[PDB]
Amino acid sequence: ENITQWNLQDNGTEGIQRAMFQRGVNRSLHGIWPEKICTGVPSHLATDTELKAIHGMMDASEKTNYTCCRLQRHEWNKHGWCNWYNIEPWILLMNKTQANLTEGQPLRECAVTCRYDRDSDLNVVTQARDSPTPLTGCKKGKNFSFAGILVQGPCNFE
Ligand SMILES: *[C@@H]1O[C@H](CO)[C@@H](O[C@@H]2O[C@H](CO)[C@@H](O[C@@H]3O[C@H](CO[C@H]4O[C@H](CO)[C@@H](O[C@@H]5O[C@H](CO)[C@@H](O)[C@H](O)[C@@H]5O)[C@H](O)[C@@H]4O)[C@@H](O)[C@H](O[C@@H]4O[C@H](CO[C@H]5O[C@H](CO)[C@@H](O)[C@H](O)[C@@H]5O)[C@@H](O)[C@H](O)[C@@H]4O)[C@@H]3O)[C@H](O)[C@H]2NC(C)=O)[C@H](O)[C@H]1NC(C)=O
Ligand SMILES: *[C@@H]1O[C@H](CO)[C@@H](O[C@@H]2O[C@H](CO)[C@@H](O)[C@H](O)[C@H]2NC(C)=O)[C@H](O)[C@H]1NC(C)=O
Ligand SMILES: *[C@@H]1O[C@H](CO)[C@@H](O[C@@H]2O[C@H](CO)[C@@H](O)[C@H](O)[C@H]2NC(C)=O)[C@H](O)[C@H]1NC(C)=O
Ligand SMILES: *[C@@H]1O[C@H](CO)[C@@H](O)[C@H](O)[C@H]1NC(C)=O
Ligand SMILES: *[C@@H]1O[C@H](CO)[C@@H](O)[C@H](O)[C@H]1NC(C)=O
Ligand SMILES: [Zn+2]
Ligand SMILES: [Zn+2]
């Protein structure tokens, strides 16, 4: 079982969260994490042409104006190659996961990190996953905002 984490838009968070806001993106895939973290030399070096096939995944780096392919390459190198063995299945899963994220809130969306906003008395979700996890930056007893969708608890089922 693989952790599936993604970023959520927020004008209040600098970096990708703000870029996503400006571009009308709500969810941008961060990664699919099996337990094993790749160490050592990748079996194949990912090209920009391969990495751009993950449509909708925005890079976390300003050095590419939040496009491709620093984050994508990093994901292949650190979590990809040693687990999927070939770039093809990995791009297919990554692309299809990002498609489901673009087509609204998934099956299980659980907050990972928040930015508590005093003006709206809300825990704005900056990163979510498909499994519950101890939170960070989330004020106790306050409601959650997953790219505008308001939820009672830390885990959103739509
Ligand atoms: C969660 O995360 C997991 C990773 O940690 C994901 O699992 C991986 O899934 C990918 C597919 O999405 C698998 O990738 C393929 O791997 C085979 C080789 O696998 C063989 O060896 C590994 C170990 O070395 C074993 O894998 C697993 O074993 C456990 C045992 O209990 C079981 O769970 C499964 O059996 C599982 O597979 C196992 O021994 C396995 O047999 C590659 O061959 C794949 O590449 C394909 O083959 C092409 C090369 O030649 C091919 O040419 C023709 C086409 O002309 C093909 O039809 C033939 O197959 C022929 O071989 C490639 O060029 C081409 O890209 C093609 O796709 C592919 O790399 C990977 O094994 C899984 N890894 C693990 C560790 O399980 C899991 O999907 C994730 N799940 C979710 C829900 O997110
Ligand atoms: C990646 O996912 C996209 C969807 O985000 C797939 O795009 C579809 O491609 C077919 C065939 O060209 C079109 O008929 C659909 O209209 C496309 N869908 C959308 C929503 O644009 C794409 O095929 C996927 N595969 C790869 C390898 O990138
Ligand atoms: C991002 O999420 C919002 C909802 O949180 C999407 O929809 C908004 O509301 C109506 C539908 O109820 C849409 O037609 C508007 O475009 C959205 N308005 C605002 C101000 O966000 C929105 O469409 C999603 N973005 C994408 C790319 O699908
Ligand atoms: C987005 O943030 C910038 C910088 O804090 C601010 O100037 C702008 O008014 C913000 N827009 C909204 C809609 O909050
Ligand atoms: C995408 O959505 C469908 C329907 O919710 C689901 O069955 C499928 O497993 C999802 N695909 C991925 C790659 O998460
Ligand atoms: Zn674990
Ligand atoms: Zn990583």
Curated annotation (Swiss-Prot):
Organism per entry: Bovine viral diarrhea virus (strain CP7) (BVDV)
Protein name: E(rns) glycoprotein
Catalytic residues, chain numbering: 74 (for e(rns) glycoprotein rnase activity), 75 (for e(rns) glycoprotein rnase activity), 78 (for e(rns) glycoprotein rnase activity), 79 (for e(rns) glycoprotein rnase activity)
Role according to the record: Initial binding to target cell probably involves interaction of E(rns) with glycosaminoglycans. Also possesses intrinsic ribonuclease (RNase) activity that can inhibit the production of type I interferon and assist in the development of persistent infections.
Disulphide-bonded residues: 38-82, 68-69, 110-155, 114-138
Site, as annotated: Hydrogen donor to release the cleavage products of E(rns) glycoprotein RNase activity: 30
Quaternary structure, from the entry: Homodimer; disulfide-linked.
Subcellular location: Host membrane; Virion membrane
Residue span relative to the full protein: 271 to 428 of 3907
Post-translational modifications: Heavily glycosylated.
Positions annotated as glycosylated: 2, 11, 26, 65, 95, 100, 143
Regulation of protein activity: Inhibited by Zn(2+), which binds the catalytic site.
Catalytic activity: a ribonucleotidyl-ribonucleotide-RNA + H2O = a 3'-end 3'-phospho-ribonucleotide-RNA + a 5'-end dephospho-ribonucleoside-RNA + H(+); a ribonucleotidyl-ribonucleotide-RNA = a 3'-end 2',3'-cyclophospho-ribonucleotide-RNA + a 5'-end dephospho-ribonucleoside-RNA; a 3'-end 2',3'-cyclophospho-ribonucleotide-RNA + H2O = a 3'-end 3'-phospho-ribonucleotide-RNA + H(+)
Topology with respect to the bilayer: Peripheral membrane protein
